[PDB]
PDB file of C-alpha atoms (C1' of nucleotides) in Angstrom:
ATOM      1  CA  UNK W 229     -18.164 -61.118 -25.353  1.00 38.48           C
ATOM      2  CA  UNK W 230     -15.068 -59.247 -25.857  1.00 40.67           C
ATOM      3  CA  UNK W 231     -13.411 -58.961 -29.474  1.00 40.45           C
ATOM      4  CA  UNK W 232      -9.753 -58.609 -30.294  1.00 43.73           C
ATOM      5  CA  UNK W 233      -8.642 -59.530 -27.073  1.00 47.81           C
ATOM      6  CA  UNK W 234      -5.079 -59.065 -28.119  1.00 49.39           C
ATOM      7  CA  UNK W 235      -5.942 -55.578 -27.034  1.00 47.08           C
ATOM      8  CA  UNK W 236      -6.998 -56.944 -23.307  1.00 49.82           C
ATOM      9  CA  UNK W 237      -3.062 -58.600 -22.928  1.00 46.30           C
ATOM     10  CA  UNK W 238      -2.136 -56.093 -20.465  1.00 46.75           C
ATOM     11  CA  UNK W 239      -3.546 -56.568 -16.985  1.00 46.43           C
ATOM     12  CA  UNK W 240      -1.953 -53.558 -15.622  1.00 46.00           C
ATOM     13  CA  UNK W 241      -3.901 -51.348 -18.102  1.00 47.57           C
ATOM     14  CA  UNK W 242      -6.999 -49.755 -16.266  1.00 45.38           C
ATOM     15  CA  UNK W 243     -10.098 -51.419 -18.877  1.00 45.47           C
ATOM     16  CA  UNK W 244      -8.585 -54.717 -18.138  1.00 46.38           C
ATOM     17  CA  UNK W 245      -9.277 -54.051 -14.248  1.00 49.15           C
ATOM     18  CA  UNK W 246     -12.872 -52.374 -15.564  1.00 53.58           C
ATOM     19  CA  UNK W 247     -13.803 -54.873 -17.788  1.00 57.17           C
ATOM     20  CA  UNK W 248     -12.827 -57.724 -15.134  1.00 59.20           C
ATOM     21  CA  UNK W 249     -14.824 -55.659 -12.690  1.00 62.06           C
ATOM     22  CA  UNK W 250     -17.859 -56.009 -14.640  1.00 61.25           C
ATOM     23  CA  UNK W 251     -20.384 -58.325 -13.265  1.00 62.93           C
ATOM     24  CA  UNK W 252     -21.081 -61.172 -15.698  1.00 59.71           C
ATOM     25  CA  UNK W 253     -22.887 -64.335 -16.074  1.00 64.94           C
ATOM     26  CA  UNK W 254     -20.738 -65.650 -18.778  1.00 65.71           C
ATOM     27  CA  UNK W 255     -17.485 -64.395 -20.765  1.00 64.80           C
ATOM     28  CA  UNK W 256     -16.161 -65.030 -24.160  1.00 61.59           C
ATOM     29  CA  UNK W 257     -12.986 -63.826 -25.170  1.00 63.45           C
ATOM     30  CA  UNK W 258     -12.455 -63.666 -28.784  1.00 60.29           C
ATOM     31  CA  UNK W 259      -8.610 -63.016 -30.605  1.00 61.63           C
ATOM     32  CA  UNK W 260      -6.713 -63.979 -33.617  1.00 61.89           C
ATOM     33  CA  UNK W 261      -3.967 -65.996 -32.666  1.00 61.68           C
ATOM     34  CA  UNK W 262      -3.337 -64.824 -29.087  1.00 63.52           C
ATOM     35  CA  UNK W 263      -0.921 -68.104 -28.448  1.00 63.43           C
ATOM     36  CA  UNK W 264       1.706 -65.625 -30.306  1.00 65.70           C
ATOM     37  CA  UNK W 265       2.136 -63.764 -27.275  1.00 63.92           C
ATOM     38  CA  UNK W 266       4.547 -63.972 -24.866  1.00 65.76           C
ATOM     39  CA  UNK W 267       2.896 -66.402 -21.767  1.00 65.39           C
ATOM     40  CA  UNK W 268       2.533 -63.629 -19.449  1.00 65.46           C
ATOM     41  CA  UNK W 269      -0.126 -62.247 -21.373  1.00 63.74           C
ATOM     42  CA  UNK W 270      -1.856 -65.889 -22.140  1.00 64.55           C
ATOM     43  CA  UNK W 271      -1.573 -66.040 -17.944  1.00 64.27           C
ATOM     44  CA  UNK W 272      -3.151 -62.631 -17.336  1.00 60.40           C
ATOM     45  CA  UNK W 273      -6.302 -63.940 -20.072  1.00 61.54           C
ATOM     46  CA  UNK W 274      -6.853 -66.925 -17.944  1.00 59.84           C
ATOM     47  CA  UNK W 275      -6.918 -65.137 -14.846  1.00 59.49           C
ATOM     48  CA  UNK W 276      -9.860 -63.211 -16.808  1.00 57.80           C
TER      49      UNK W 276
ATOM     50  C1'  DT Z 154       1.093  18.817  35.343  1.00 59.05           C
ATOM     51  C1'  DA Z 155      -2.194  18.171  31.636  1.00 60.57           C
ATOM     52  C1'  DG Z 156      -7.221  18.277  31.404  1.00 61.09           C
ATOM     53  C1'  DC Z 157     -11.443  20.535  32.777  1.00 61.19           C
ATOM     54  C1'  DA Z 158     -14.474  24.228  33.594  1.00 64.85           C
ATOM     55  C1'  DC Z 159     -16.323  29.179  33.290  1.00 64.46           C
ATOM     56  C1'  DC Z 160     -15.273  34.298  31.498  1.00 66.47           C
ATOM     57  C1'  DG Z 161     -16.081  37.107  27.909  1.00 62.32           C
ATOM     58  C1'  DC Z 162     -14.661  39.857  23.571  1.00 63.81           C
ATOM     59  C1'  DT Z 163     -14.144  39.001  18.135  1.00 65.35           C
ATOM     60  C1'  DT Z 164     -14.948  37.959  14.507  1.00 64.56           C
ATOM     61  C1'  DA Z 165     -16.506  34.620  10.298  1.00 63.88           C
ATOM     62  C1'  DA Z 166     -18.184  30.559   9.272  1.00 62.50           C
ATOM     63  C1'  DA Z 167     -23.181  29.058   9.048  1.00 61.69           C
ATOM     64  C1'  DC Z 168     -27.289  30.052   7.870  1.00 61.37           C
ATOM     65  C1'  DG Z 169     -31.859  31.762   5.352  1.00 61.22           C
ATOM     66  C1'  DC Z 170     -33.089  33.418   1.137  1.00 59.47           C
ATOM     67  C1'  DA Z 171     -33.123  35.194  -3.397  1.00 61.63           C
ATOM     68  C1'  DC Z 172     -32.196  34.316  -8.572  1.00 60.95           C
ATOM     69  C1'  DG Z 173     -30.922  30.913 -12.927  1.00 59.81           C
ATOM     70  C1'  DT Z 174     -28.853  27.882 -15.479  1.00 60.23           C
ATOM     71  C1'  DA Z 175     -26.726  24.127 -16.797  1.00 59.46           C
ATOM     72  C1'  DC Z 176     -27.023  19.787 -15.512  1.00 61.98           C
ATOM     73  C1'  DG Z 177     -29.648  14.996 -15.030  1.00 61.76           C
ATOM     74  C1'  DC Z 178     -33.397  12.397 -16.623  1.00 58.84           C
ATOM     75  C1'  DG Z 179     -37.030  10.665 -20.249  1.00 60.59           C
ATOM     76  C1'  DC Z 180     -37.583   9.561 -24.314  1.00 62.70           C
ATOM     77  C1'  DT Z 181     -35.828   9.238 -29.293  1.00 61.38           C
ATOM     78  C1'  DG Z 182     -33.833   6.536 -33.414  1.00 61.42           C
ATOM     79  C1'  DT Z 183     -29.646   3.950 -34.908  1.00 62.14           C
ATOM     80  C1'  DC Z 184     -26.716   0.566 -35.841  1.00 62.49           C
ATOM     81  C1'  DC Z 185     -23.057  -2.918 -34.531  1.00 63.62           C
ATOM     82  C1'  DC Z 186     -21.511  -6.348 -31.855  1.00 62.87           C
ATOM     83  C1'  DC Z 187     -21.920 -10.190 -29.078  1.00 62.89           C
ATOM     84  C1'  DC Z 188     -25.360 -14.171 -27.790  1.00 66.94           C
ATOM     85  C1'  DG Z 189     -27.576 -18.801 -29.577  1.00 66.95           C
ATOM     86  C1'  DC Z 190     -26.328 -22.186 -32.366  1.00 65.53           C
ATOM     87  C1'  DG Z 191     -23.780 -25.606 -36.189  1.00 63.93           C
ATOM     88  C1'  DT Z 192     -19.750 -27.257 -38.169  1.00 64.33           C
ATOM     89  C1'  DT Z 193     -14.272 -28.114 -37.900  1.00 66.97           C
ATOM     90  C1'  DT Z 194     -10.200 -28.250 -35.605  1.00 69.31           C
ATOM     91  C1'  DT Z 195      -7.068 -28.928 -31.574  1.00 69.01           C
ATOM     92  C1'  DA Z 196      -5.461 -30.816 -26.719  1.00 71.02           C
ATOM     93  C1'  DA Z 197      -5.563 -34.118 -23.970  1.00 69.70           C
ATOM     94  C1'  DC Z 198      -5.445 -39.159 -22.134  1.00 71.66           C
ATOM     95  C1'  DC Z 199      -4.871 -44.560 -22.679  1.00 71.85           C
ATOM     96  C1'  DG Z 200      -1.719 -47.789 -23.596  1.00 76.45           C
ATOM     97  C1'  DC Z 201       2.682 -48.622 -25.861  1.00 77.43           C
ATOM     98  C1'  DC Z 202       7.188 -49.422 -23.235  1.00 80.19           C
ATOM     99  C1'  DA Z 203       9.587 -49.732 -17.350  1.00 79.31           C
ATOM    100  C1'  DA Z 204      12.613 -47.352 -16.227  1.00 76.21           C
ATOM    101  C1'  DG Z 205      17.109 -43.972 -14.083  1.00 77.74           C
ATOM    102  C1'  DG Z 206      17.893 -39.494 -11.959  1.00 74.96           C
ATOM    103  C1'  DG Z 207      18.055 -36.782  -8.552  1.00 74.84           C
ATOM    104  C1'  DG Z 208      15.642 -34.769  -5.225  1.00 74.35           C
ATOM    105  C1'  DA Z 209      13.721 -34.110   0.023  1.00 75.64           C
ATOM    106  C1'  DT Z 210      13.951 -36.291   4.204  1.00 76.08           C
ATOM    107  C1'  DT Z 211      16.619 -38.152   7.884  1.00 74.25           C
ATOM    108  C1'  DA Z 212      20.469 -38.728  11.131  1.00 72.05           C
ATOM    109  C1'  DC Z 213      25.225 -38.222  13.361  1.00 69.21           C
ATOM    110  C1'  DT Z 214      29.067 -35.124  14.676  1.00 65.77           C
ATOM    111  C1'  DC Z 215      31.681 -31.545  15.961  1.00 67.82           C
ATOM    112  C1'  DC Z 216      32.359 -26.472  17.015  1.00 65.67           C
ATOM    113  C1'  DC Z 217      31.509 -22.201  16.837  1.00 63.54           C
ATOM    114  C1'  DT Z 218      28.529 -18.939  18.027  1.00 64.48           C
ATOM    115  C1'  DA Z 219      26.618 -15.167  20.834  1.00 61.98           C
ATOM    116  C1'  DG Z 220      23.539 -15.977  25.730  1.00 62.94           C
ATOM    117  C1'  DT Z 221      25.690 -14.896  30.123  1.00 62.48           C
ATOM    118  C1'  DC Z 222      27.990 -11.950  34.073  1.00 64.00           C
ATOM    119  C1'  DT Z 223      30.919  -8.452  34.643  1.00 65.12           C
ATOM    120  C1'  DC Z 224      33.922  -3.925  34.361  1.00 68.17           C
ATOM    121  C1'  DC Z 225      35.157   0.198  31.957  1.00 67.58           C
ATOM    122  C1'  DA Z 226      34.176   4.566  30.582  1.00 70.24           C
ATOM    123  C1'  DG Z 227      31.330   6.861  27.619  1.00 69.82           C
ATOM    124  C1'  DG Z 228      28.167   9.374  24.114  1.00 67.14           C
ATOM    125  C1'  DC Z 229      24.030  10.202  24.148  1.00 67.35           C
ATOM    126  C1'  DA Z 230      19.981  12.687  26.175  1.00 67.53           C
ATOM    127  C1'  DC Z 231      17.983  16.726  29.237  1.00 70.84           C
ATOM    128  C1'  DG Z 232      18.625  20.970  29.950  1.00 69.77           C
ATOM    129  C1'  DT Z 233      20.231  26.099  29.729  1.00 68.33           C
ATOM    130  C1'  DG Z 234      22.368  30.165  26.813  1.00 70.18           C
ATOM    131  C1'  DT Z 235      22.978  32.271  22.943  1.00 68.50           C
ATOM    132  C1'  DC Z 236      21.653  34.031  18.557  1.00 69.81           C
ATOM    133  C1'  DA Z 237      17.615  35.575  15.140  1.00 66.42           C
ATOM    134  C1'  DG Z 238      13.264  36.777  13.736  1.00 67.28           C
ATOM    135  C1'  DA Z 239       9.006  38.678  13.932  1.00 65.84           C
ATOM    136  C1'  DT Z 240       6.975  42.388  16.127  1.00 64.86           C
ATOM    137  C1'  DA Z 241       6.911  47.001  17.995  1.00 63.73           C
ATOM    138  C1'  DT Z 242       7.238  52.266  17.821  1.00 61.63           C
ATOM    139  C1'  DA Z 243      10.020  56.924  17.174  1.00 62.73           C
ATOM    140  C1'  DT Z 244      11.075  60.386  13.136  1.00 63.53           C
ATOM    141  C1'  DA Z 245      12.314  63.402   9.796  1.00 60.55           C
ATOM    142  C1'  DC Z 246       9.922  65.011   7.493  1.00 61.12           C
ATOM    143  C1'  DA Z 247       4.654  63.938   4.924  1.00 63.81           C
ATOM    144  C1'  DT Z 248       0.544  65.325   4.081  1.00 65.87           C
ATOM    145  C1'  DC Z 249      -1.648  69.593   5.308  1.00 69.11           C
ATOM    146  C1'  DC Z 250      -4.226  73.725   8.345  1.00 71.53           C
ATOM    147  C1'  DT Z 251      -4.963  78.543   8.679  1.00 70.25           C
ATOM    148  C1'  DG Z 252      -4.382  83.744   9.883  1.00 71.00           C
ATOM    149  C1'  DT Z 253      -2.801  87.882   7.018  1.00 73.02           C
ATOM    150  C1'  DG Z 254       0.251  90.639   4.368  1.00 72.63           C
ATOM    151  C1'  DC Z 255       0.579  91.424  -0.685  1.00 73.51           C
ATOM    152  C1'  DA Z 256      -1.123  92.383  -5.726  1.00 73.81           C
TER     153       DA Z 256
END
DNA sequence: TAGCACCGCTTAAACGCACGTACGCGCTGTCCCCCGCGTTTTAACCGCCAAGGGGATTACTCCCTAGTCTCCAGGCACGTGTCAGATATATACATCCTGTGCA
């Protein structure tokens, strides 16, 4: 599970390529209200 | 022609040995500072936010530079002559001996 992942919105940044490194056998992403961000961001949380 | 070898005097630098003395080591007590450790503070990076500046590398294009052969005539090097110094030895008395005439 991650919380806040507002904070995650940035693929670029090097604990969104850690975290998505991480081997998993399910993922929950928990934000307030990420649909206010631009889509690029919404994109780069999908692709997570 | 500079190094090698043997001659063979002349010191003097090495050496053995003697005495002592002041230096190095063993042990002392002291005390202060720098380790082992705990708590606070600072320096640094992630991510924010994505670039523009300007720098090193790369190439083309003359052209100027001194690598080249060559003559000219020299100024620099190899040597001999001259001048000076350190060494050598007479001298004008220096430092004295000694028969003998004088007090």
């Amino acid at each position: 599970v991650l919380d806040e992942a507002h904070n995650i919105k940035n693929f670029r940044s090097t604990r969104w390529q850690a975290l998505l490194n991480f081997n998993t056998q399910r993922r929950l992403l928990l934000t307030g209200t990420p649909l206010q961000n631009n889509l690029a961001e919404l994109w780069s949380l999908l692709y997570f």
